[PDB]
Coordinates of C-alpha atoms and ligand atoms in Angstrom, one line a residue:
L11 CA -6.3 0.4 -67.2
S12 CA -8.4 1.2 -70.3
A13 CA -8.4 1.9 -74.2
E14 CA -9.3 5.7 -75.1
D15 CA -9.3 6.5 -71.3
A16 CA -5.6 5.9 -71.1
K17 CA -4.7 8.1 -74.2
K18 CA -7.1 10.7 -72.6
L19 CA -5.1 10.8 -69.5
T20 CA -1.8 10.9 -71.4
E21 CA -2.8 13.8 -73.5
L22 CA -3.9 15.7 -70.3
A23 CA -0.4 15.3 -68.8
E24 CA 1.3 16.3 -72.1
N25 CA -0.9 19.4 -72.2
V26 CA -0.3 20.3 -68.6
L27 CA 3.5 19.5 -68.6
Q28 CA 3.9 22.5 -71.4
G29 CA 3.7 24.8 -68.2
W30 CA 7.0 23.3 -66.8
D31 CA 10.3 22.8 -68.6
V32 CA 10.4 19.1 -68.7
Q33 CA 11.5 16.9 -71.6
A34 CA 8.6 14.5 -71.6
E35 CA 9.8 11.1 -73.2
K36 CA 7.3 8.5 -71.8
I37 CA 4.4 9.0 -69.6
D38 CA 2.8 6.3 -67.5
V39 CA -0.5 6.7 -65.6
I40 CA -0.1 5.2 -61.9
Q41 CA -2.7 6.1 -59.3
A46 CA -5.8 11.8 -56.8
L47 CA -4.5 11.2 -60.3
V48 CA -0.5 10.5 -60.5
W49 CA 1.7 10.1 -63.6
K50 CA 5.4 9.0 -63.7
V51 CA 7.0 11.3 -66.4
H52 CA 10.2 9.8 -67.9
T53 CA 13.0 12.4 -69.1
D54 CA 16.2 12.2 -71.0
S55 CA 17.7 10.2 -67.9
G56 CA 15.7 10.2 -64.5
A57 CA 12.0 10.7 -63.8
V58 CA 9.6 13.3 -62.3
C59 CA 6.1 12.8 -60.8
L60 CA 3.0 14.8 -62.1
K61 CA 0.1 14.6 -59.6
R62 CA -3.5 16.2 -60.2
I63 CA -4.6 17.1 -56.8
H64 CA -8.3 16.2 -56.0
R65 CA -8.8 17.8 -52.7
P66 CA -10.4 21.5 -52.7
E67 CA -7.9 24.5 -53.3
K68 CA -7.6 25.6 -49.5
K69 CA -6.6 22.2 -48.5
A70 CA -4.4 21.5 -51.4
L71 CA -2.4 24.7 -50.7
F72 CA -1.8 23.9 -47.1
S73 CA -0.1 20.5 -48.2
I74 CA 1.6 21.8 -51.4
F75 CA 3.4 24.6 -49.2
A76 CA 4.0 22.1 -46.4
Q77 CA 6.0 20.0 -48.6
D78 CA 8.0 22.7 -50.2
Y79 CA 8.9 23.7 -46.5
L80 CA 9.9 20.3 -45.6
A81 CA 11.8 19.7 -48.8
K82 CA 13.7 23.0 -48.5
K83 CA 14.5 22.5 -44.8
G84 CA 16.2 18.9 -45.6
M85 CA 13.5 16.4 -44.7
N86 CA 13.2 13.5 -46.9
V87 CA 10.0 14.5 -49.0
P88 CA 10.0 15.0 -52.8
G89 CA 11.0 18.4 -53.8
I90 CA 8.6 20.4 -56.0
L91 CA 9.7 21.6 -59.3
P92 CA 8.8 25.4 -59.9
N93 CA 6.9 25.7 -63.2
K94 CA 7.8 28.3 -66.0
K95 CA 6.0 31.0 -64.1
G96 CA 7.9 30.3 -60.9
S97 CA 4.9 28.7 -59.1
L98 CA 4.8 25.5 -57.3
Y99 CA 1.6 24.4 -59.1
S100 CA -0.7 25.1 -61.9
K101 CA -4.6 25.5 -61.7
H102 CA -6.7 24.0 -64.7
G103 CA -10.3 23.9 -64.0
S104 CA -11.2 22.8 -60.6
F105 CA -7.8 21.0 -60.1
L106 CA -4.2 21.9 -59.0
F107 CA -1.4 20.3 -61.0
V108 CA 2.2 19.8 -59.2
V109 CA 5.5 18.2 -60.5
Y110 CA 7.6 16.6 -57.9
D111 CA 11.1 14.9 -58.1
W112 CA 10.5 11.0 -58.5
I113 CA 12.3 9.3 -55.6
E114 CA 13.8 6.1 -56.3
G115 CA 13.5 3.3 -53.4
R116 CA 11.8 0.1 -52.1
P117 CA 8.6 -0.2 -49.9
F118 CA 8.9 -1.4 -46.5
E119 CA 8.2 -5.1 -45.3
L120 CA 6.3 -4.9 -42.0
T121 CA 7.2 -8.3 -41.1
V122 CA 10.9 -7.5 -41.1
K123 CA 12.2 -5.8 -37.8
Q124 CA 14.5 -3.3 -39.4
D125 CA 11.9 -2.1 -41.8
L126 CA 9.6 -1.6 -38.9
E127 CA 12.2 0.5 -37.2
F128 CA 13.0 2.5 -40.2
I129 CA 9.3 3.5 -41.0
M130 CA 8.9 4.7 -37.2
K131 CA 12.2 6.7 -37.4
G132 CA 11.0 8.4 -40.5
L133 CA 7.8 9.4 -38.9
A134 CA 9.7 10.9 -36.0
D135 CA 11.8 12.8 -38.6
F136 CA 8.7 14.1 -40.2
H137 CA 7.1 15.3 -36.8
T138 CA 10.4 17.2 -35.8
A139 CA 11.1 18.7 -39.1
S140 CA 7.5 19.9 -39.6
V141 CA 7.6 22.2 -36.5
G142 CA 7.8 25.7 -37.7
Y143 CA 5.7 25.3 -40.8
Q144 CA 3.0 28.1 -41.4
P145 CA 1.2 28.3 -44.6
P146 CA 1.6 31.5 -46.5
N147 CA -0.8 34.5 -46.5
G148 CA -4.3 33.7 -47.6
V149 CA -3.8 29.8 -47.2
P150 CA -5.8 28.7 -44.0
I151 CA -4.5 26.4 -41.4
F152 CA -5.9 22.7 -41.4
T153 CA -5.9 21.7 -37.7
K154 CA -7.5 19.1 -35.5
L155 CA -5.9 20.4 -32.2
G156 CA -8.1 20.0 -29.1
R157 CA -10.9 18.3 -31.2
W158 CA -10.6 14.5 -30.1
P159 CA -13.2 14.9 -27.3
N160 CA -15.7 16.0 -29.8
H161 CA -14.7 13.7 -32.5
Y162 CA -15.2 10.6 -29.9
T163 CA -18.6 12.0 -29.0
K164 CA -19.6 12.2 -32.6
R165 CA -18.6 8.6 -33.2
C166 CA -20.4 7.4 -29.8
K167 CA -23.5 9.1 -31.0
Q168 CA -23.2 7.7 -34.6
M169 CA -22.9 4.2 -33.2
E170 CA -26.2 4.8 -31.2
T171 CA -27.8 6.3 -34.4
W172 CA -27.0 3.1 -36.5
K173 CA -29.3 1.0 -33.9
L174 CA -32.1 2.6 -35.7
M175 CA -31.2 1.2 -39.3
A176 CA -29.9 -2.1 -37.3
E177 CA -33.5 -2.7 -35.7
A178 CA -34.7 -2.3 -39.4
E179 CA -32.9 -5.4 -40.4
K180 CA -34.7 -8.0 -38.1
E181 CA -33.3 -11.1 -39.9
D182 CA -29.7 -10.4 -40.0
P183 CA -26.8 -11.8 -37.8
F184 CA -24.5 -8.9 -38.1
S185 CA -27.3 -6.4 -36.9
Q186 CA -28.9 -8.8 -34.2
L187 CA -25.2 -9.2 -32.8
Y188 CA -24.9 -5.4 -33.0
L189 CA -27.9 -4.7 -31.2
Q190 CA -27.0 -6.9 -28.4
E191 CA -23.4 -6.0 -27.5
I192 CA -22.6 -2.5 -28.9
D193 CA -23.8 -0.5 -25.8
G194 CA -20.9 -1.8 -23.8
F195 CA -18.4 -0.3 -26.4
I196 CA -20.3 2.9 -26.6
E197 CA -20.1 3.4 -22.8
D198 CA -16.4 2.5 -22.8
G199 CA -16.0 5.0 -25.6
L200 CA -17.4 7.9 -23.6
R201 CA -15.5 6.9 -20.7
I202 CA -12.2 6.9 -22.6
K203 CA -13.2 10.7 -23.6
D204 CA -13.4 11.4 -19.9
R205 CA -10.0 9.6 -19.3
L206 CA -8.6 11.8 -22.2
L207 CA -10.0 14.9 -20.6
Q208 CA -8.0 14.1 -17.2
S209 CA -4.8 13.5 -19.1
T210 CA -2.4 16.5 -20.4
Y211 CA -4.3 16.3 -23.7
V212 CA -5.7 19.8 -23.3
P213 CA -2.6 21.6 -22.1
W214 CA -0.6 19.6 -24.8
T215 CA -2.9 20.6 -27.8
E216 CA -2.9 24.3 -26.4
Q217 CA 0.9 24.3 -26.4
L218 CA 1.1 22.8 -29.9
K219 CA -1.4 25.6 -31.3
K220 CA 1.4 28.0 -30.8
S221 CA 4.2 26.0 -32.6
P222 CA 2.5 22.8 -34.2
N223 CA 3.8 19.8 -35.9
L224 CA 2.2 18.4 -38.7
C225 CA 0.4 14.8 -38.7
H226 CA 0.6 12.8 -42.0
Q227 CA -2.8 11.2 -41.4
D228 CA -2.3 8.3 -43.8
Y229 CA 1.2 7.1 -43.0
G230 CA 2.0 3.7 -44.0
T231 CA 4.0 1.2 -46.4
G232 CA 2.0 2.7 -49.5
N233 CA 3.5 6.4 -48.5
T234 CA 7.0 5.6 -47.5
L235 CA 10.3 4.3 -49.1
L236 CA 13.8 3.4 -48.3
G237 CA 16.1 5.0 -50.6
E238 CA 19.9 5.3 -51.0
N239 CA 22.1 5.4 -48.0
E240 CA 19.2 3.9 -45.9
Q241 CA 17.3 7.1 -46.0
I242 CA 13.8 7.0 -45.2
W243 CA 11.3 9.0 -47.5
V244 CA 7.8 10.3 -47.0
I245 CA 5.9 10.5 -50.3
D246 CA 2.2 11.6 -50.3
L247 CA 1.5 14.7 -48.1
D248 CA -2.0 15.5 -49.4
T249 CA -3.8 14.8 -46.1
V250 CA -1.4 16.5 -43.7
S251 CA -2.8 18.7 -40.8
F252 CA -1.8 20.1 -37.4
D253 CA -2.3 17.4 -34.7
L254 CA -0.5 15.6 -31.8
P255 CA 2.2 13.5 -33.1
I256 CA 0.8 10.4 -31.3
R257 CA -2.2 10.4 -33.7
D258 CA 0.2 9.0 -36.5
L259 CA 1.5 6.3 -34.0
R260 CA -2.0 5.2 -33.0
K261 CA -3.2 5.1 -36.8
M262 CA -0.3 3.1 -37.8
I263 CA 0.2 0.7 -34.8
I264 CA -3.3 -0.3 -33.8
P265 CA -4.6 -1.6 -37.3
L266 CA -1.0 -3.4 -37.6
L267 CA -1.8 -5.3 -34.3
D268 CA -5.4 -5.9 -35.1
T269 CA -5.9 -9.6 -34.3
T270 CA -8.5 -12.1 -32.6
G271 CA -5.4 -13.9 -30.9
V272 CA -2.6 -12.5 -29.0
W273 CA -1.5 -8.8 -28.6
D274 CA 1.8 -8.6 -30.2
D275 CA 3.9 -6.7 -27.4
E276 CA 7.3 -7.3 -29.0
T277 CA 6.1 -5.5 -32.3
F278 CA 4.5 -2.8 -30.2
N279 CA 7.8 -2.3 -28.2
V280 CA 10.0 -2.3 -31.5
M281 CA 7.9 0.4 -33.0
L282 CA 7.7 2.7 -30.1
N283 CA 11.2 2.1 -28.9
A284 CA 12.3 3.2 -32.7
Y285 CA 10.1 6.2 -32.7
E286 CA 11.2 7.2 -29.2
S287 CA 14.9 6.9 -30.2
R288 CA 14.5 10.1 -32.3
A289 CA 11.4 11.6 -30.9
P290 CA 11.2 10.9 -27.2
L291 CA 7.7 11.1 -25.4
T292 CA 7.2 11.9 -21.8
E293 CA 5.1 9.4 -19.7
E294 CA 2.1 12.1 -19.7
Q295 CA 2.4 12.2 -23.5
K296 CA 2.5 8.4 -23.6
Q297 CA -0.7 8.3 -21.5
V298 CA -2.6 10.5 -23.9
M299 CA -1.6 8.2 -26.7
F300 CA -2.5 4.9 -24.8
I301 CA -6.0 6.5 -23.8
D302 CA -6.6 7.4 -27.5
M303 CA -5.5 3.7 -28.6
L304 CA -8.3 2.4 -26.4
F305 CA -11.0 4.3 -28.3
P306 CA -12.7 1.6 -30.7
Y307 CA -11.6 3.3 -34.1
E308 CA -11.1 -0.2 -35.8
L309 CA -14.5 -1.3 -34.4
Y310 CA -16.1 1.8 -35.9
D311 CA -14.5 1.3 -39.3
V312 CA -16.1 -2.2 -39.4
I313 CA -19.4 -0.9 -38.5
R314 CA -19.3 2.0 -41.2
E315 CA -18.5 -0.8 -43.9
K316 CA -21.9 -2.4 -42.9
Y317 CA -24.3 0.6 -42.5
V318 CA -22.9 3.7 -44.4
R319 CA -21.2 1.7 -47.4
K320 CA -23.8 -1.2 -47.3
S321 CA -21.4 -4.1 -47.7
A322 CA -23.3 -7.1 -46.4
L323 CA -20.5 -8.4 -43.8
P324 CA -21.3 -11.5 -41.8
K325 CA -21.4 -12.0 -37.9
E326 CA -17.8 -13.2 -37.8
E327 CA -16.3 -9.9 -38.8
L328 CA -18.3 -7.9 -36.2
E329 CA -17.2 -10.5 -33.3
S330 CA -13.7 -10.4 -34.6
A331 CA -13.7 -6.6 -34.3
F332 CA -15.3 -6.9 -30.8
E333 CA -12.6 -9.3 -29.8
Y334 CA -9.7 -7.1 -30.9
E335 CA -11.2 -4.3 -28.8
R336 CA -11.2 -6.5 -25.6
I337 CA -7.8 -7.9 -26.4
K338 CA -6.3 -4.4 -26.8
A339 CA -8.3 -3.1 -23.5
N340 CA -6.4 -5.9 -21.5
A341 CA -3.1 -5.0 -23.1
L342 CA -3.3 -1.3 -22.3
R343 CA -5.1 -1.4 -19.0
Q344 CA -1.9 -0.7 -16.9
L345 CA -0.7 2.0 -19.2
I346 CA -3.9 4.6 -19.1
Ligands
LIG1 N1 7.4 10.8 -56.1 C1 7.2 9.6 -55.8 N2 8.4 8.8 -55.7 C2 8.4 7.5 -55.5 N3 7.1 6.7 -55.8 C3 6.0 7.4 -55.9 C4 6.0 9.1 -56.2 N4 4.7 9.3 -56.2 C5 3.8 8.1 -56.3 N5 4.7 7.0 -55.9 C6 4.5 5.5 -56.0 O1 3.3 5.1 -56.9 C7 3.1 3.7 -56.4 C8 1.7 3.2 -56.8 O2 1.7 2.1 -57.7 C9 3.4 3.7 -54.7 O3 4.1 2.7 -54.4 C10 4.1 5.1 -54.6 O4 5.2 4.9 -53.7

């Protein structure tokens, strides 16, 4: 939203679109930089991918694979030279079909069920994808134990700068209670190493599914004939499918009050109706859900980003970890 800056971006789109055979009539800047390009009668999406060329290609080819396989992801329009993308400077440009649909309302039960079935569809459909020759794989298979340790060591490291701010309620409460959550973090790592996590990750290294890694109401839509579409595949990588469940369910249920088990059931039941999980697989998920990822995000706002948050937000983050621990104690 600006004066000369808006016409600057519009002119970039017009210049880049010459590479495709698209009748550009009206161009709107939306969001990575995204444009809605209106044509004769129906639109296309022009996206400037921000990410480095190696990671960019992995997701571009992943999307082409999924689109051509029949999964509900926007298809890629080939350019005049027959390629899925054009390189200009340090950026990749891609033209996708603009999908028409409404966003989901997480307070409505049927939408919560739709969004989970689409996640299951995405996971199942992605199995078989391998990037082309020269494009390296992006994978996190078998890395969670190290990722937990890096985070438990990072929470210890932040006590150095926590002790620096002597007259600060957030840092005062942090120095008093954080050790108990760090200890539990490393104990959750130990529980993960006794689960089927390792054999499961090793079996998937051979024929892996993709994890979306940023799945939510911002990247999904309900189109015609109640079809669920997944829109932004820029952060896809190979990982256990349960990562997307955790990453979607735990933040949604974040609360200082009561654990919403009904919503938890509605979401897992909907996911499992299309991609059922064994008891062992679910154990791995529940173990991962106990790790303090949401507490970490709240701590990262205060020490890395330096946002002066008050004591209430730290205690509120600790309380959700306790509430969640009680809710999942019998499932791990
Ligand atoms: N191919 C696409 N189809 C539909 N919506 C899109 C596409 N790319 C980006 N968007 C939308 O842009 C909006 C941001 O204002 C989001 O709601 C997102 O769904």
